[PDB]
Design a protein around this nucleic acid. Structure first.
Ligand SMILES: C[S@@+](CC[C@H](N)C(=O)[O-])C[C@H]1O[C@@H](n2cnc3c(N)ncnc32)[C@H](O)[C@@H]1O
Lengths: 262, 128, 178, 238
DNA sequence: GTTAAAGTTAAGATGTTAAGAAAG
DNA sequence: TTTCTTAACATCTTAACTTTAAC
């Protein structure tokens, strides 16, 4: 009835990708003290896809030790790093206009946004039957994905995760996109319309902003599908053309320039 | 004290809405909203048609549309509307009366009585 | 259908689908005005009801591909392009239309392929001058089509106006005949 | 074609009589008090916003309600496509330039409340800017996820991702912390059916009812489906 | 005589770009 | 010479409609 077997179908298809390790040349690992005040031109050049995996210290999150939005203006994304490309960033409610304004000041222009709609893990489990460690959350995600047909009889609106917020209860996360042109003579190659701007995902209510594994894979696949020439083909490209800020220390994407805050 | 929403709406529509949207009393005109935009028969239009029924010839809707109206009304609209006034579905028998405006209700009532007696009421229009 | 709502919502095509005669007229018209000149296709008038989107999708179906930009402002033979699009096998299609699964089109490739298609599939001046579009009279309402004038999207008033206009048309035709 | 023409004429006269009886029944129902779908307590304004006297709206709202509107809902007629498109969406209404939408006296029309301005992806940034220079603080965004009648996502089309949702940006202006506005209500997601071109969900209205119960609201660009109770609505086809 | 199961079509609140109308 | 409007450009999905094979 709710068609949850289709909105959640990608969780049965998008396999997480094993890291290519630092020894191989398929990925580059960069370790800096802090990213927003680091000269990133030496960590890459001629970029095409920048993914700032920033967790924001917003007032809605209950002291989760995030990132101040005021420090992003200290970032330096010069024309040398990215000349014509797309920047992907995580945005919250009260700093969305701040992100858009700061990007417009940088030299970027808003193009699109990509929303992750949140279904409560606890509500889904409650409908199935009637602090959590990350492995328990993954196991419950597998359980609710396996027993989804019994969940087909419950309305989506009663399964949405409605989290605390002063004005309207949070039920989604947003990945804004911005584009840098630089020179209109050189055109950036794209596969347009290849995936939807809205996806559905089961999440935990403690901190839905931090997207886990097997969901960061969906964002990754959207990035690589949107930019085909940004992929690193071994043997015929000299430098990596895809770069992530604030990446995980254990999951280094095979084809990306990962920058770790440490 | 909480605001009376019905009275507030009536006052707002009387003060600042169009003549077709609202009414003289201030109630909402459902007639404007049960017809397509632009295809509304205002009471002014009906009064103009009633003036032209006996000011001009019945049937000659070119002259009634150009002179009495502004030249922007459908001929079929005018014929159907005077069918509504006359209470009959065929105004061919009433082609060009041109005598007086004060008995249109009289012939309407006569057609209504004929339909009632002959079982041809049919939503207040006598079938012929 | 609810006729009370505004005209902005529920955009329709009046004429629902493509017929054999309509597609033959489109085949004739694409060879005289050229592929892509939809404004000049509709302005002269040979597609009574078809929108620009319908003609666009029908052209895509005629050539077997949605890369219409290779034939921009250019008159060619539709059958040969359809044959060559059906002949090749290493392509992926949906609704029998060949999709560019490779790189995005470029400006110089556009001009090069336009010139190449003009040289290969282009028609001579004799074939351009030979084709004659059906000249529809400009004093004709939606003649006949009792299933298309009795449309749910139209109100009773609009349907009756169309019926009266058509009835006056047969009256005029009998007056001319008699 | 004579006997067939006579049969066609007879069928045409029969259909004329049938549709004439239908029209007569409809208008006799209208004359004898036929209630329309728009509720009684609605204020529909059929005017062009570039020429509308907004001072009349402000003066009558002060005279009757005693306070400016608590919520303004805007879904502007952005420049996206034409009424006769070649490839995609078929926007059948007059576009407005961003300067004209900017030039509305929204700042002179509200004192403390919420803007609920709908936006498209091409006009998202200019929507944020419009909220900014109207004196408002963009704080919330409600995404209406379009749903098929079966229950899927009504995916449209785009240039980077396939557009399947619409963003209504909500901003605040002044005092909200008083008892009129209720905090921490509803959700920022409206997973609801796509039921017309540029047809906004009904649920957003209830969300407004969950935000400012028993308040005065104004819809700046509204069609005949946007009339609700306690809602002033403006448009050119109202 | 129905029935469920593929083809087919239009409809969807895309950005971009060649081609002139129009101001120099 | 510069810019402003219109038309036309492809790379997608899903429901409604149409057509077709099967019991
Ligand atoms: C996008 S529609 C509103 C649709 C509404 N959200 C719904 O759910 O149906 C905005 C309307 O503004 C109207 N409009 C366009 N130009 C206008 C103008 N210059 N002045 C006033 N109204 C205008 C058009 O009728 C258009 O349909």
């Amino acid at each position: 009835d709710n068609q949850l077997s289709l909105l959640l179908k990608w969780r049965n298809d998008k396999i997480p990708l094993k890291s290519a390790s630092e020894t191989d040349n398929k990925c580059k690992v960069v370790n800096v003290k802090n990213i927003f005040k680091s000269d990133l031109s030496k960590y890459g050049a001629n970029l095409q896809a920048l993914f700032i995996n920033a967790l924001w210290k917003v007032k809605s999150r209950k002291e989760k030790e995030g990132l101040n939005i005021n420090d992003l203006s200290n970032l330096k994304i010069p024309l040398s790093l990215m000349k014509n490309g797309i920047l992907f960033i995580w945005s919250e409610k009260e700093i969305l206009g701040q992100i858009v304004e700061i990007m417009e000041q940088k030299g970027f222009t808003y193009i699109e946004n990509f929303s992750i709609m949140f279904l409560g893990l606890n509500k889904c489990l409650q409908s199935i039957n009637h602090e959590k460690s990350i492995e328990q959350v993954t196991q419950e995600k597998k359980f609710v994905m396996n027993n989804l047909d019994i969940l087909k009889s419950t309305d989506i609106n009663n399964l949405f995760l409605r989290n605390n917020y002063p004005y309207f209860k949070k039920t989604r996360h947003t990945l804004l996109m911005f584009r840098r042109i630089g020179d209109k003579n050189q055109k950036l190659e794209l596969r347009h319309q290849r995936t939807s701007d809205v996806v559905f995902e089961v999440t935990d209510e403690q901190d839905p902003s931090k997207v886990d594994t097997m969901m960061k894979e969906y964002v990754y696949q959207m990035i690589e599908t949107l930019l085909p020439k940004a992929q690193f083909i071994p043997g015929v490209d000299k430098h990596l053309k895809m770069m992530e800020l604030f990446a995980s220390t254990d999951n280094y994407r095979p084809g990306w320039i990962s920058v770790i805050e440490k | 004290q909480p605001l009376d929403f019905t009275q507030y709406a009536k006052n707002m529509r009387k003060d600042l809405s169009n003549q077709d949207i609202c009414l003289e009393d201030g109630a909402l005109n459902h007639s404007y909203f049960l017809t397509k935009k632009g295809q509304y028969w205002t009471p002014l239009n009906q009064k103009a048609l009633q003036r032209g029924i006996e000011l001009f010839g019945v049937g000659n809707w070119k002259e009634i549309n150009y002179d009495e109206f502004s030249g922007k009304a459908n001929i079929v609209e005018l014929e159907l509307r005077t069918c509504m006034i006359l209470g009959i579905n065929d105004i061919t028998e009433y082609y060009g009366k041109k005598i007086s405006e004060e008995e249109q209700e009289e012939i309407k009532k006569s057609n209504i009585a004929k339909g009632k007696k002959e079982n041809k009421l049919k939503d207040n229009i006598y079938q012929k | 259908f609810q006729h009370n709502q505004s005209k902005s919502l529920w955009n329709y095509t009046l004429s629902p689908g493509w017929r054999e005669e309509e597609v033959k007229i489109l085949k004739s018209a694409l060879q005289l005005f050229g592929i892509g000149k939809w404004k000049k296709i509709m302005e002269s008038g040979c597609l009574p009801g078809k929108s620009i989107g319908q003609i666009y999708m029908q052209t895509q179906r005629l050539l077997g591909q949605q890369s219409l930009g290779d034939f921009m402002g250019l008159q060619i033979d539709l059958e040969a392009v359809f044959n060559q699009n059906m002949k090749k096998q290493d392509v992926l299609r949906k609704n029998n239309c060949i999709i560019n699964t490779g790189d995005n089109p470029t400006k110089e490739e556009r001009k090069r392929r336009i010139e190449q298609n003009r040289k290969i599939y282009g028609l001579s001046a004799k074939q351009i001058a030979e084709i004659k579009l059906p000249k529809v009279k400009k004093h004709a309402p939606q003649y006949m089509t009792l299933e298309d004038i009795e449309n749910e999207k139209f109100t009773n008033l609009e349907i009756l106006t169309h019926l009266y206009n058509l009835k006056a048309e047969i009256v005029r035709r009998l007056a001319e005949q008699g | 074609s004579k006997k067939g023409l006579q049969g066609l004429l007879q069928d045409i006269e029969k259909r004329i009589l049938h549709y004439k009886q239908l029209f007569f029944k409809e208008q006799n129902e209208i004359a004898n008090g036929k209630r329309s779908m728009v509720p009684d307590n609605s204020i529909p304004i059929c005017s062009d916003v570039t020429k509308l006297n907004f001072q009349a709206l402000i003066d009558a709202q002060m005279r009757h309600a005693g306070k400016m509107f608590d919520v303004i809902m805007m879904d502007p007629p952005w420049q996206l496509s034409s009424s006769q498109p070649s490839r995609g969406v078929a926007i059948a209404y007059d576009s407005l330039s961003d300067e004209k939408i900017q030039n509305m006296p929204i700042q002179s029309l509200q004192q403390d409340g919420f803007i609920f301005v709908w936006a498209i992806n091409a006009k998202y940034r200019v929507t944020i800017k419009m909220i900014e220079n109207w004196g408002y603080k963009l704080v919330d965004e409600i995404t209406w996820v379009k749903k098929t009648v079966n229950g899927k996502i009504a995916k449209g089309h785009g240039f980077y991702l396939q557009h399947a949702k619409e963003s209504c940006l909500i901003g605040v202006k002044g005092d909200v912390d008083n008892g009129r506005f209720k905090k921490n209500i509803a959700s920022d997601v409206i997973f609801s059916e796509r039921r017309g071109q540029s047809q906004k969900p009904e649920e957003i209205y209830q969300y407004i009812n969950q935000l400012c119960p028993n308040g005065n609201y104004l819809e700046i660009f509204a069609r005949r489906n946007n009339l609700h109770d306690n809602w002033v609505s403006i448009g050119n086809e109202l």
